[PDB]
Amino acid sequence: AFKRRRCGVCEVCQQPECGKCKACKDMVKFGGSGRSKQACQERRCPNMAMKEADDDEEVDDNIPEMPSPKKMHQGKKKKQNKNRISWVGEAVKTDGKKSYYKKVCIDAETLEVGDCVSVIPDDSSKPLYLARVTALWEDSSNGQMFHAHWFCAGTDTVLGATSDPLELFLVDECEDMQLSYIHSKVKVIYKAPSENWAMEGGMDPGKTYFYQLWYDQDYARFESPPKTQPTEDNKFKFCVSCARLAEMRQKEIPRVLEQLEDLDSRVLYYSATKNGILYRVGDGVYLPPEAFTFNIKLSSPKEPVDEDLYPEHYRKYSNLDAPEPYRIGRIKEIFCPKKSNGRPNETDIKIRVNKFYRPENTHKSTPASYHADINLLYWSDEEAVVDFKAVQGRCTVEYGEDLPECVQVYSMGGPNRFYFLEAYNAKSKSFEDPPNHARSPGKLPKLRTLDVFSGCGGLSEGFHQAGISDTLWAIEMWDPAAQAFRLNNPGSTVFTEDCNILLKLVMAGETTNSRGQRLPQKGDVEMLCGGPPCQGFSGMNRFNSRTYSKFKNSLVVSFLSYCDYYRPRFFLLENVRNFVSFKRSMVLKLTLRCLVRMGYQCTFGVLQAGQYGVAQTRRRAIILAAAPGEKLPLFPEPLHVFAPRACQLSVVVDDKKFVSNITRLSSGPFRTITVRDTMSDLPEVRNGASALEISYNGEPQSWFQRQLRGAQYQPILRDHICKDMSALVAARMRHIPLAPGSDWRDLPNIEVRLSDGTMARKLRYTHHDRKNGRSSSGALRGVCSCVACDPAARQFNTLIPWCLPHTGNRHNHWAGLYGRLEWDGFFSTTVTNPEPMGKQGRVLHPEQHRVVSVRECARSQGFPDTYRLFGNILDKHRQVGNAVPPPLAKAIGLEIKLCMLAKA
DNA sequence: TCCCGTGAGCCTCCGCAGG
DNA sequence: CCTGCGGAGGCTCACGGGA
Ligand SMILES: Nc1ncnc2c1ncn2[C@@H]1O[C@H](CSCC[C@H](N)C(=O)O)[C@@H](O)[C@H]1O
Ligand SMILES: [Zn+2]
Ligand SMILES: [Zn+2]
Ligand SMILES: [Zn+2]
Ligand SMILES: [Zn+2]
Numbered sequence: 001a002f003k004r005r006r007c008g009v010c011e012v013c014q015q016p017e018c019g020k021c022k023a024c025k026d027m028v029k030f031g032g033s034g035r036s037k038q039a040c041q042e043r044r045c046p047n048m049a050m051k052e053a054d055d056d057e058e059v060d061d062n063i064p065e066m067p068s069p070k071k072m073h074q075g076k077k078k079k080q081n082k083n084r085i086s087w088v089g090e091a092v093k094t095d096g097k098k099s100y101y102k103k104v105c106i107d108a109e110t111l112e113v114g115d116c117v118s119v120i121p122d123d124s125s126k127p128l129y130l131a132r133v134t135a136l137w138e139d140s141s142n143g144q145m146f147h148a149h150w151f152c153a154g155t156d157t158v159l160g161a162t163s164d165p166l167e168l169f170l171v172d173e174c175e176d177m178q179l180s181y182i183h184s185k186v187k188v189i190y191k192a193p194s195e196n197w198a199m200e201g202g203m204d205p206g207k208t209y210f211y212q213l214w215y216d217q218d219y220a221r222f223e224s225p226p227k228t229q230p231t232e233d234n235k236f237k238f239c240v241s242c243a244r245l246a247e248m249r250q251k252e253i254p255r256v257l258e259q260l261e262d263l264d265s266r267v268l269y270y271s272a273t274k275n276g277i278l279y280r281v282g283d284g285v286y287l288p289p290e291a292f293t294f295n296i297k298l299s300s301p302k303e304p305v306d307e308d309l310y311p312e313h314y315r316k317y318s319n320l321d322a323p324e325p326y327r328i329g330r331i332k333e334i335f336c337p338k339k340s341n342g343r344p345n346e347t348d349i350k351i352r353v354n355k356f357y358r359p360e361n362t363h364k365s366t367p368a369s370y371h372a373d374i375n376l377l378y379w380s381d382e383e384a385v386v387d388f389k390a391v392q393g394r395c396t397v398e399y400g401e402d403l404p405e406c407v408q409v410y411s412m413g414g415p416n417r418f419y420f421l422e423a424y425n426a427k428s429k430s431f432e433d434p435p436n437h438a439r440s441p442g443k444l445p446k447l448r449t450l451d452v453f454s455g456c457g458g459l460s461e462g463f464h465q466a467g468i469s470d471t472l473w474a475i476e477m478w479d480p481a482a483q484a485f486r487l488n489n490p491g492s493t494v495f496t497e498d499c500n501i502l503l504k505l506v507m508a509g510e511t512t513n514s515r516g517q518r519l520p521q522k523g524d525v526e527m528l529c530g531g532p533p534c535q536g537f538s539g540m541n542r543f544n545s546r547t548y549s550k551f552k553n554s555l556v557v558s559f560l561s562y563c564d565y566y567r568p569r570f571f572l573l574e575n576v577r578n579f580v581s582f583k584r585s586m587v588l589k590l591t592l593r594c595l596v597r598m599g600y601q602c603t604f605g606v607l608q609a610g611q612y613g614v615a616q617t618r619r620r621a622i623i624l625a626a627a628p629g630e631k632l633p634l635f636p637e638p639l640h641v642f643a644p645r646a647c648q649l650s651v652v653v654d655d656k657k658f659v660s661n662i663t664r665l666s667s668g669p670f671r672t673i674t675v676r677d678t679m680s681d682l683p684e685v686r687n688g689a690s691a692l693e694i695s696y697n698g699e700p701q702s703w704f705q706r707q708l709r710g711a712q713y714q715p716i717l718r719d720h721i722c723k724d725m726s727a728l729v730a731a732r733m734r735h736i737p738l739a740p741g742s743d744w745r746d747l748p749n750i751e752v753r754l755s756d757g758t759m760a761r762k763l764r765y766t767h768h769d770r771k772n773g774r775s776s777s778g779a780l781r782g783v784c785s786c787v788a789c790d791p792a793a794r795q796f797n798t799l800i801p802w803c804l805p806h807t808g809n810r811h812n813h814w815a816g817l818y819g820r821l822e823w824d825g826f827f828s829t830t831v832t833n834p835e836p837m838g839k840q841g842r843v844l845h846p847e848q849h850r851v852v853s854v855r856e857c858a859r860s861q862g863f864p865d866t867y868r869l870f871g872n873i874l875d876k877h878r879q880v881g882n883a884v885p886p887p888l889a890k891a892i893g894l895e896i897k898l899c900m901l902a903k904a
Numbered sequence: 905t906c907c908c909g910t911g912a913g914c915c916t917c918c919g920c921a922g923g
Numbered sequence: 924c925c926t927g928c929g930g931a932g933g934c935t936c937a938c939g940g941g942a
Contacts, residue, residue: 003918003931022925027916035927037917048918051932541910 006045055576135237284395329353462889688724743819832881
C-alpha cells in the first residue's frame with residue numbers, strides 16, 4: 001500500500017503550472033471544479049519514484065564527544081549486617097595463605113559455589129546486582145571473602161527497555177567482595193538453545209531470571225557462553241571471567257622466542273610475537289606514519305571577483321584530511337637491551353627495519369601513485385630502529401621477479417601482500433636495482449545463500465568474490481533489478497515478486513509458485529542477507545501507536561520473519577547509516593531484541609565504504625547474526641585510508657557510546673582511492689549521449705582501473721550513457737569553473753542563448769537580506785519578499801536557480817549542489833538518480849560539461865565493468881544507486897570465512 | 905531571540921476502479 | 924483512454940520547552 005512521488009530537484013518539477021491544458025486548468029485555484037485531482041501536463045516528473053530513500057543528510061552523527069561505558073557495574077555496593085556466618089565441611093583446598101570451602105551459611109541460609117547471589121548498590125536509582133559466586137575462602141587476615149562473577153541486567157544493555165525483564169547476560173566483570181555484602185540467593189536458570197533449534201520457525205511477535213548469551217559492553221555483541229573448562233588446581237574457585245582476562249592480558253604483552261647471540265648488553269633474537277601474530281626475521285611489518293621519516297625532504301606545499309557579475313559567490317563562506325598509509329619495512333634484526341648482569345629484557349624489544357618506499361614517497365611525489373599498484377614499493381638502503389610494541393601488524397613483501405607466478409595473481413591470493421621491482425636512492429634521487437641480498441631466501445563448502453531485496457545483486461556480488469556464499473534464491477519485486485540479477489547469477493532462480501507473498505506460501509506449506517519455481521524450504525538456506533528498504537518510517541522522532549503499527553507491518557520485520565522460518569547460520573542486514581538512530585534508535589533496538597529473542601548471536605556497527613576500496617562517502621549500518629553453534633563474525637578492517645570527516649563510525653544509543661571491533665580508525669595498508677583512479681580512462685562523451693556500447697579509447701591508467709576493467713577479450717564499454725539534462729541545465733553546467741570545489745554559487749549572473757535559441761534572462765534581487773546585507777557594490781541580495789512568500793516574486797528560466805538563494809539562507813547555502821567533482825576528491829554518497837539540485841547532488845563531471853554516467857556510477861561503486869545491468873537509463877541508475885559496494889561486501893564476507901573455518 | 909520539534913490540518917496528486 | 928474518486932504523504936503554520 002505504498003505509492004511513489006515526484007522528486008523536488010529536476011527542472012520539470014520547478015516549472016510553473018501554466019494553465020492551458022485540461023488537467024492543469026481544471027484545478028480548484030483556477031475556477032475549475034477540481035474533481036479531477038491532477039497535476040499540470042508540463043509537470044509530469046520523470047525521476048518520479050517512492051520516497052523510500054532515507055538517510056537524509058542529518059547531523060545526528062556529529063557531537064561525538066562522549067566517554068566509554070563499562071559502568072564497572074557501578075561502585076560502592078551497600079554493605080549488609082550479618083548475625084552469623086559459618087563455613088561447612090573441610091576446606092576444599094588450602095594452599096598459600098587461604099582456605100577455600102564448598103558451601104557456606106549466612107543467617108541459616110545456604111550459599112553454594114555456583115549459586116547466584118544478589119547485592120544492593122549505593123544509589124537507589126540503579127537496580128540490584130546479581131552474580132554467580134565462583135569461590136569462597138578464608139584469608140589469613142582479610143577474613144571471609146568470595147569472588148562474584150557479575151550479571152548484567154537486560155535494562156543495562158543496548159536493548160535497554162525492549163529487553164525481557166527476566167533476561168540477564170554474562171559479562172566479564174568480577175570483584176572479590178566481603179561476604180557481608182550479600183542480600184539474597186536468587187535462582188538463575190540457563191535457557192540453553194534447543195537441540196533441534198533450526199526448525200522452530202513459526203511464532204508470534206519466562207518465570208524467573210535466566211541467562212542465555214554473553215554480552216560485550218563496549219562492542220554491543222551477543223555471543224554464545226564461553227566453553228572454557230576448569231582444571232584440577234582451581235576447579236573449586238574457577239572464574240570464566242578471570243580466565244578470559246588472563247588470556248587476553250597474555251595476548252597483549254609482546255614476548256620473544258629463539259635467540260642468536262649476546263653483545264653489548266643486547267641479545268639478538270630471531271623470532272618474537274605480539275597479539276597472536278608471529279614475526280620472524282625477513283617478514284613484512286606495518287608501522288604508524290610517525291615511525292620514521294624518509295631522508296627525502298618531506299614534500300612541502302586570487303584577487304576579488306566582479307562583485308556584480310558573480311552575486312551569490314559570497315555564499316562560499318564555509319581527501320586533504322586523509323591520513324598517510326602504513327609504513328612498511330623488512331625485519332632484519334630482532335633484539336633487546338640489557339642491564340649489565342642480565343641478558344634478556346621485556347617491555348623494551350626493538351626492531352631493525354629496512355624502510356620501504358611508496359611511489360607517493362619518492363621525490364616524484366604523490367602523482368606517481370596514479371599508475372602505480374596500491375601494493376607496489378621500492379627497496380632502499382636506509383634503515384631504522386623502532387620500538388617493537390609499535391608495529392601495527394604483519395605483512396608480506398616479496399621480490400616481483402622471484403614471484404613463482406603472475407604478479408597480478410600473487411596479490412589476489414592474499415590479504416596484506418606487497419611487492420617491489422626496483423631500488424630507490426634518496427640522495428641520488430635515482431632508481432637503482434634491488435641488491436641480491438634483498439630477494440627472498442629462495443577451501444570450504446560454499447554457503448547456500450538467499451538474498452531477498454537482492455536488487456541488481458550488489459551485496460551478493462561481494463560474497464561471490466570472497467567465495468563464501470552461493471546465491472541460489474533471489475527475491476526482487478522490481479522487474480528491472482530482478483532481470484539484471486539473473487544476468488549475473490544464472491545459476492539461481494529469481495523470485496520476481498513481493499517478499500510478504502512467498503513467506504506467506506512456504507509457511508502455509510507449498511512447493512512452488514504460480515510461475516512454477518522451487519521455493520526455499522527449512523534447511524535449504526544456509527545464509528540469509530539483504531537490504532530492507534526502510535520507507536514507512538524514515539523518521540527520527542519518538543515512536544507512536546500509529547506509526548509503530550506501520551512498523552510492525554514493514555519490510556524490516558518481514559526480513560526478520562524470513563530469518564525466523566529459516567534459522568540460517570549467518571544473517572546479514574545492511575542498510576543506511578541512520579538505521580541505528582531512526583525513531584530514537586528504537587527500530588534498531590527492536591530488530592536486535594528480535595534476533596536475541598530467537599536466541600541468536602548478533603552485533604551491529606557502521607562501515608565507511610570508502611575505507612574498503614571505493615572513492616565514495618557511503619557510511620552504512622550492519623547487523624550481523626550467527627546461529628547458536630557458530631562464531632559471531634568480526635567487522636572488516638579498513639584497507640584504505642580515508643578522510644576522517646566521513647568516518648564518524650561511532651554510534652550512540654541512550655547516553656551510551658557503542659563502537660566496533662575495528663582497530664584501524666586512522667591509518668591503513670593501502671592509499672585512498674581518488675576520482676582519478678575511479679574514472680580517468682573513460683572517453684569524452686556529451687550530455688544525453690545514449691550509446692549503450694562503445695570502445696575504450698585508451699588503455700587503463702590506474703590500478704583501481706586495471707581491476708574493474710576486467711580481463712574479457714571483449715573491450716565492450718557498456719552503459720557509458722548519462723541523463724539528458726535540459727537545454728537550460730546544459731547552460732548552467734557549462735558555466736561552472738573546473739576549479740576544485742566550484743558549484744552554483746560561482747555562476748555568472750548574465751543572459752545567454754541556449755541550444756534552443758531561447759534566451760534565459762538574468763536574476764533580480766529586488767529585496768534585502770537582514771542577514772546578508774548588500775553586495776560589495778551595494779547591490780541587493782534578497783530573492784523573495786520573505787528573506788510571507790510573494791508568489792509573484794518568483795522567476796523562471798534563469799541561469800542561477802531562483803529557488804537556491806530563496807531557501808539558501810537556511811540549508812547551509814546548498815554548498816555542493818550543481819557542483820563539479822574534483823579529481824583528487826571523491827564522489828559523495830552515490831544516489832539512485834543524479835540530479836544537479838539533489839540533496840547530495842555534487843555530481844557534475846570534473847571537466848566535461850555533463851552529469852556522471854551510469855558506468856561512472858558503477859565505478860563509484862565497486863562494480864566491475866563485466867557486471868551487467870538492465871532497463872532504461874534511469875532504471876540503471878537506480879540499481880547502482882541502491883546496490884552495495886562489492887569491495888565492501890567482499891571485505892565483509894571474509895570476516896565471515898574466518899568463522900566458517902572456526903567450526904569448533 | 906533563535907531553534908527544532910510535534911502535531912493538526914490544508915494542499916497536492918497517484919493509483920485505480922469503472923465506464 | 925478518460926473522469927472522477929478514495930485517500931496517502933508532505934508542506935505549512937500555530938505553539939511549547941530549551942539554551
Ligand atoms: N519487500 C520487497 N520485495 C521485493 N522487492 C523489494 C521489496 N522492497 C523493496 N524492493 C525493491 O528492491 C530495490 C532495492 S534493492 C537494495 C539492494 C541492496 N542495496 C543490496 O544489493 O544489498 C527497490 O528498488 C525496490 O523496488
Ligand atoms: Zn522531479
Ligand atoms: Zn497544464
Ligand atoms: Zn573473576
Ligand atoms: Zn519566499
